[PDB]
Design a protein around this ligand. Structure first.
Ligand SMILES: *[C@@H]1O[C@H](CO)[C@@H](O[C@@H]2O[C@H](CO)[C@@H](O[C@@H]3O[C@H](CO)[C@@H](O)[C@H](O)[C@@H]3O)[C@H](O)[C@H]2NC(C)=O)[C@H](O)[C@H]1NC(C)=O
Ligand SMILES: *[C@@H]1O[C@H](CO)[C@@H](O[C@@H]2O[C@H](CO)[C@@H](O[C@@H]3O[C@H](CO)[C@@H](O)[C@H](O)[C@@H]3O)[C@H](O)[C@H]2NC(C)=O)[C@H](O)[C@H]1NC(C)=O
Ligand SMILES: *[C@@H]1O[C@H](CO)[C@@H](O[C@@H]2O[C@H](CO)[C@@H](O[C@@H]3O[C@H](CO)[C@@H](O)[C@H](O)[C@@H]3O)[C@H](O)[C@H]2NC(C)=O)[C@H](O)[C@H]1NC(C)=O
Ligand SMILES: Nc1ncnc2c1ncn2[C@@H]1O[C@H](COP(=O)(O)OP(=O)(O)OP(=O)(O)O)[C@@H](O)[C@H]1O
Ligand SMILES: Nc1ncnc2c1ncn2[C@@H]1O[C@H](COP(=O)(O)OP(=O)(O)OP(=O)(O)O)[C@@H](O)[C@H]1O
Ligand SMILES: Nc1ncnc2c1ncn2[C@@H]1O[C@H](COP(=O)(O)OP(=O)(O)OP(=O)(O)O)[C@@H](O)[C@H]1O
Ligand SMILES: *[C@@H]1O[C@H](CO)[C@@H](O[C@@H]2O[C@H](CO)[C@@H](O)[C@H](O)[C@H]2NC(C)=O)[C@H](O)[C@H]1NC(C)=O
Ligand SMILES: *[C@@H]1O[C@H](CO)[C@@H](O[C@@H]2O[C@H](CO)[C@@H](O)[C@H](O)[C@H]2NC(C)=O)[C@H](O)[C@H]1NC(C)=O
Ligand SMILES: *[C@@H]1O[C@H](CO)[C@@H](O[C@@H]2O[C@H](CO)[C@@H](O)[C@H](O)[C@H]2NC(C)=O)[C@H](O)[C@H]1NC(C)=O
Ligand SMILES: *[C@@H]1O[C@H](CO)[C@@H](O)[C@H](O)[C@H]1NC(C)=O
Ligand SMILES: *[C@@H]1O[C@H](CO)[C@@H](O)[C@H](O)[C@H]1NC(C)=O
Ligand SMILES: *[C@@H]1O[C@H](CO)[C@@H](O)[C@H](O)[C@H]1NC(C)=O
Ligand SMILES: [Mg+2]
Ligand SMILES: [Mg+2]
Ligand SMILES: [Mg+2]
Lengths: 330, 330, 330
């Protein structure tokens, strides 16, 4: 009778699996659906800089967010080098293009790599001790060898980021916003997001977001960096929608490998003064924030329920037949 | 013989499932592939505004599309508040930062939240009846309490959006454009997209796109909003490519919850006048259009066909054995 | 005994499949994970243009990359038409809006499609032989009928694109950059990517990228185009991370169908001169580069290993029972 006792145990273990795991845990009675998301970001916070060339400079949201309209990926400026009042003309090329001593060491034209301008074939003086090729281009050339340290916009640590995420589960016609029912105006007036204390506030302090990605804002501010923000919507639509909540994770890794460690870009502000076209060239160091929204909604459906029941019946039958096979041999 | 009759029915029902559903409907004879897509958008249409501060202002595509080069996510401006000729200096801070009565009610420095400038510790007059902290910043401060109603660019309803979607099924080396063979120059000259009448015209009226997402353009224009546009490519590559067509759906939900209901951003136009740097500050209300392109191409392949045949043979055999088991007990 | 010999062969063939394919090839012992990616791009290279209206014009990275901060999708300008010093006023509308002969042929207001301005009801002269509606708008109207050929920025072929891709496998806590251990500073100083010679250099020549997508840079430069760049991370995390490498593919199809073949957009540079607001209107033809990053990391896990073992046991048992069934009938 011991073989018969084993038969029953195996039959029940199989039934316990088929129900508890496949039907209940894995939710085999549910049809699944992905989402389509929209993310809007608003930055708040102010930075002031005191350069030697200029006076106090105010940096508000319109000036330190790239793009201004926002996106899933956006940059907050944390440092910059500015080359003001650049004009198109002839100047000494930056020594990174090459250092010459005579006019014969310059070839007219463009460098094969990282050309700064059209070489005129003339070796002119970059400074009092270095002579470089004369070029036609934006003059004076940018000198970005000294990255400002501490970062010019290191006050961006206290900037607040408001993420407005609108998601739709199109199959189930369910619309959710990360501004969930628990979020009200009083919360939006004072709340700052906290992984455990305030996991639903959609206003994030930038320094907290960088800290939670495992990075140091002081290091990321000087040369730039990347913080990934994931918003996950794992919703069981058999329950009320008020349980369909977003989960926030922050990702990032800054290493001292010193091979392109940070993030920077160059942009220019063009203007006309005294009838001549000028530009301000900025090398902008900043943290790029990538906001990735994924999710999965499940709702009970009859067709998955029957299909799962059929699969469980098949699993149960195969098990019984193989056990009758194994016992025949034993 | 009734048991034998049932045996045959169950055997055939199983065969009917294995062929008709798994092989034919679910297309188990096909290998599947996702796509890689590119979306370009061109807006057309003009808006004119008549502000009290300025004269008639023309708003063409270069000015109301953010970004100008386009993207999967782009904003069309439908309303704005403009603060012209802002300069960096000292002014009264906006009363939203706090209302003071004496110089002692102001602390020099920055507010912890939503700082507008560097407080100087002086309580100056915002208007004839309100006194606020004096700040260093962009002056005069923006006053965006009165959103223009009706929307300044409510004529954007008649703007036309041209979506050019290029998709590739890299596994099958198949390239498709949403400008399908049925779309010609004569169509692009006059066609407007219609869910049923013109489901292939790639020129969309903005108001129609908002209406089809379930929203009201008049409401979305004043404070902004979001419309999701999905392009789906469900193509059976056993047929001619001319049947590989895109399907357009429009998604969106505007609610009167009054907690961040619309969409807005701030951007600045910088300029130099009389040797002093100025900026025009715009608070731009607009509809963000997210274009999501997904799809799936199937082509007959021999390996899925054999694997499906093996799976069907297994299903048929398991069924017969379990039926011989059930009949043994019956 | 021949039937018994077949039984064993089928049993072993089944075991060979269950191990070699399912366990070893398909890696059924591994748990899988997707990635979250961040892409930053830096363009380098210079172009000079010699228009008849202006002098030599220098085009560096800040001016020919849209957006300047970069994105997954970005545009490199390869051609442009410029309408300088546009002001809001009254001018002759472009003849594409319609050609009139009398003032009665113009209706005040806006065109239903592709409106260029507010018609005043007056038929004025566009040129010495064409009369069009007078409009209020940006004047003079852009004339983009003659696309510059050869392309004004056809030197963009030699521009170099640096892709910095940071990916994370969040389930396995593995961070990878496309600047893999084999890439050093000496490589970044001189390397250009090559499908087979230098498959790991993250600096791409634009012309090479277009050639590898199957397109001609000369054709794409005049009217614009699209090149898709895919970065794939198919990593087996049972091995060292130094084997987690990116694979680059380039996608694109340019056809002479002449129905919206290229890519272009319009953007404006606004400025103030002599107390009047002006703008430079650019119609920018360029190649849009879409960078798509996908990947899959597998690491050995005990739960998939046991589940695969159970599936293989089930497959083996079903096979033996059906073979005993087939042999009973034979
Ligand atoms: C004139 O221009 C040249 C070139 O820009 C200047 O020389 C450069 O000066 C910087 C700062 O001292 C040097 O950077 C440092 O170099 C050492 C190695 O020598 C390195 O250990 C440091 O980490 C740092 O990178 C740079 O190498 C040097 N370049 C050359 C070609 O010597 C020069 O100082 C300028 N003169 C004046 C009057 O400003
Ligand atoms: C000087 O500045 C102050 C502050 O901006 C102005 O007071 C504000 O005026 C607006 C318009 O009347 C008020 O908005 C309305 O408030 C009521 C509640 O009182 C609300 O029901 C309406 O929906 C609307 O929001 C605003 O509350 C009020 N602020 C304060 C602090 O009283 C004032 O009118 C300005 N004076 C001049 C001469 O313009
Ligand atoms: C004044 O303006 C009108 C309208 O812009 C100019 O007429 C246009 O001239 C262009 C160039 O010759 C024509 O383009 C060509 O048309 C032929 C067909 O006629 C076509 O085969 C070519 O591929 C090309 O597209 C354009 O059709 C023509 N438009 C009209 C309405 O006739 C005119 O030349 C201008 N006059 C001066 C003095 O510049
Ligand atoms: N598109 C490109 N083509 C060639 N070299 C590039 C390109 N982008 C970056 N580099 C080079 O790669 C190295 C590291 O890149 P990175 O941009 O992070 O440093 P960087 O100092 O900010 O670069 P740079 O000052 O030259 O813009 C630099 O020496 C830079 O010149
Ligand atoms: N990054 C942020 N940090 C703190 N508060 C924010 C942030 N973004 C928005 N808010 C606040 O959230 C509330 C609602 O946001 P929303 O931007 O939709 O309204 P708003 O009136 O346009 O905001 P505002 O005028 O202050 O830019 C506003 O009171 C706004 O001040
Ligand atoms: N949003 C839109 N609404 C209506 N027509 C459009 C729109 N976008 C493009 N078109 C028209 O489609 C045709 C082909 O589009 P495409 O932009 O590629 O050519 P184009 O010459 O650059 O267009 P255009 O010069 O008018 O901007 C053009 O005649 C253009 O006028
Ligand atoms: C960001 O904000 C915090 C909080 O206001 C600042 O921390 C303060 O620093 C000053 C100067 O050291 C101290 O006197 C305060 O006591 C600190 N406050 C707290 C609560 O710790 C911080 O300096 C700010 N920094 C930046 C870069 O913006
Ligand atoms: C968008 O276009 C439609 C169609 O031209 C405009 O509807 C017209 O409105 C005027 C004024 O009420 C009527 O005289 C016309 O008969 C309407 N035409 C049609 C076909 O209904 C509409 O006003 C425009 N609105 C915006 C905001 O652009
Ligand atoms: C891009 O760079 C290549 C390489 O420098 C250029 O090819 C050169 O063209 C000139 C003029 O015909 C020849 O004298 C050189 O011998 C060529 N070099 C090589 C290695 O082939 C090319 O012209 C450049 N073009 C653009 C559009 O930038
Ligand atoms: C960042 O690094 C500096 C040293 O470079 C250290 O003093 C500081 O405390 C760090 N900040 C954090 C948040 O760890
Ligand atoms: C939008 O709402 C207004 C009332 O606020 C209504 O008069 C108008 O008809 C609505 N438009 C549409 C398209 O339903
Ligand atoms: C591009 O096309 C032109 C002809 O239009 C041809 O001369 C040239 O060689 C082509 N370039 C490449 C890279 O094939
Ligand atoms: Mg540098
Ligand atoms: Mg406000
Ligand atoms: Mg045109």
């Amino acid at each position: 009778k011991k073989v018969g006792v084993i038969f029953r145990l195996i039959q029940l273990v199989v039934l316990v699996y088929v129900i508890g795991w496949v039907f209940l845990y894995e939710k085999g009675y549910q049809t699944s659906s992905g989402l389509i998301s929209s993310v809007s970001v608003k930055l708040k916070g102010l930075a002031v800089t005191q350069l030697p060339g200029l006076g106090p400079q105010v940096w508000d949201v319109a000036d330190y967010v790239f793009p201004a309209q926002g996106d899933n990926s956006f940059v907050v400026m944390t440092n910059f080098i500015v080359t003001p009042k650049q004009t198109q003309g002839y100047c000494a090329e930056h020594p990174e293009g090459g250092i010459c001593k005579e006019d014969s060491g310059c070839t007219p034209g463009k460098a094969k790599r990282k050309a700064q301008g059209i070489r005129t074939g003339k070796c002119v003086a970059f400074n009092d001790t270095v002579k470089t090729c004369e070029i036609f281009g934006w003059c004076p050339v940018e000198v970005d060898d000294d990255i400002p340290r501490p970062a010019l916009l290191r006050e961006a640590e206290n900037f607040t980021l408001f993420i407005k995420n609108s998601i739709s589960f199109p199959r189930f016609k369910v619309n959710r916003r990360n501004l969930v029912e628990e979020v009200n105006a009083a919360h939006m007036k004072t709340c700052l997001f906290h992984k455990t204390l305030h996991p639903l506030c959609p206003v994030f302090q930038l320094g907290y977001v960088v800290q939670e990605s495992g990075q140091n804002f002081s290091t990321l501010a000087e040369k730039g960096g990347v913080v990934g923000i994931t918003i996950d919507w794992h919703c069981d639509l058999d329950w009320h929608v008020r349980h369909c909540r977003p989960i926030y994770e922050f990702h990032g890794l800054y290493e001292e490998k010193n091979l392109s460690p940070g993030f920077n870009f160059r942009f220019a502000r063009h203007f006309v003064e005294n009838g001549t076209n000028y530009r301000h060239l900025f090398k902008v160091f900043g943290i790029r924030f990538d906001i990735l929204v994924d999710g999965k909604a499940g709702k009970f459906d009859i067709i998955p329920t029957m299909t799962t029941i059929g699969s469980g019946i098949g699993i149960f039958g195969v098990a019984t037949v193989l056990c009758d096979l194994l016992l025949l041999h034993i």
